[PDB]
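Researcher: We're reviewing a set of sequences before deciding which ones to prioritize for further study. For each one, I'd like a predicted 3D structure that I can look through quickly. This is TRNA nucleotidyl transferase-related protein. If possible, include the structure in token form so it fits the rest of the review sheet.
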Amino acid sequence: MQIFRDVSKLLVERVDPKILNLFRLLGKFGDEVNMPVYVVGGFVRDLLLGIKNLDIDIVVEGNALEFAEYAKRFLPGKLVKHDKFMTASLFLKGGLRIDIATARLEYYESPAKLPDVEMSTIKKDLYRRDFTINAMAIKLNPKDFGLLIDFFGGYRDLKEGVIRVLHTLSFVDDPTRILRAIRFEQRFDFRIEETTERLLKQAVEEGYLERTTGPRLRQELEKILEEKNPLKSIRRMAQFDVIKHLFPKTYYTPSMDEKMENLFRNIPWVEENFGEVDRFYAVLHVFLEFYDDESWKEVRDRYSLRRNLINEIRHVEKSAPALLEMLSERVPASFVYPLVKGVSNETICHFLAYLSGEKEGLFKSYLLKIKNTKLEKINGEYLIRKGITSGKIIGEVLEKILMKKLDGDTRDEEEILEEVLASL
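Model: Here's the predicted structure for TRNA nucleotidyl transferase-related protein, in token form for your review sheet.
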């Protein structure tokens, strides 16, 4: 099994020359300060897959700051230190930005957060990363420029479309990789090789997800949501029984899957007509239907959710059956007003998770009819106080006019006279 391979030709072929020359310079600085320099990770994966990947991620076997400082005086830019054991970024005025980190090992005392010491060679720094396809480096120092360093069978695992962990305790160490594996599985068209699959299942069914902290998990979750085909990933989690270990009161059923399918289908039509949609919460609107208060507080606290969220979910889960019936009978827009009156985009999606076909089509417009062509034109409360006093009664009036209007009457101030007649 080949570890070292000359990928020089491939780099000159695929990488922008302005940037290739930079990699060269960096290598050269490495020698001039006696640090081995490497580009690592996704960039190398992406190169070999022939996938554009612009950013530059540098690993040095030495002091990151020394190197960034040295680099800085030949590459005019802004040098930010960081809070990471030895991490810096040089922001070049030309636009692009260099990340620079010291090669590090991770040792795990428990299945939580690892000890780090720089006291690592590049080997150890690669050995601690998640999957073989992400654990590859290319050396930038002049004599070794364009050398693929692949300790773990990553090149081969690309050509076989495989997601494979680097050692046996990989999931137990960081159970966050359970979600990450699915994510890169759907992101390329990859499969989780047998052995690692078994490892994944053990970790899932032995409590490892619960043993990890909420925030870490949430973040890998949002990341899944922003990937290309989230629904695939979600179904993959369910295939692996992950969802229930993430949310102990949610059961992923053919019923839930349908809603979830409707959900995603309709989500962009909502970002389209209504603005930004937090996909994490949209998905929770479904996951968390029918949660009891204590099951909720447990989940609300583990992942850090808004307190009101259970209220909004409950509004949809409770009003959903009524909503279907109203869309069956082509009831007037005025009748679905109270259900969506001033609700979150996420709640909207959640309503859309229940429908398809004609009901979706109608509801979709009723919604647009509300978004716009809402909006009183002339009538204020103060257009009303010229003829009529307070107070609940004027508001009542304004909404009746709004409402007769939603079904729609294009003119006006007949509507007021018209409905004050109704009031008698």
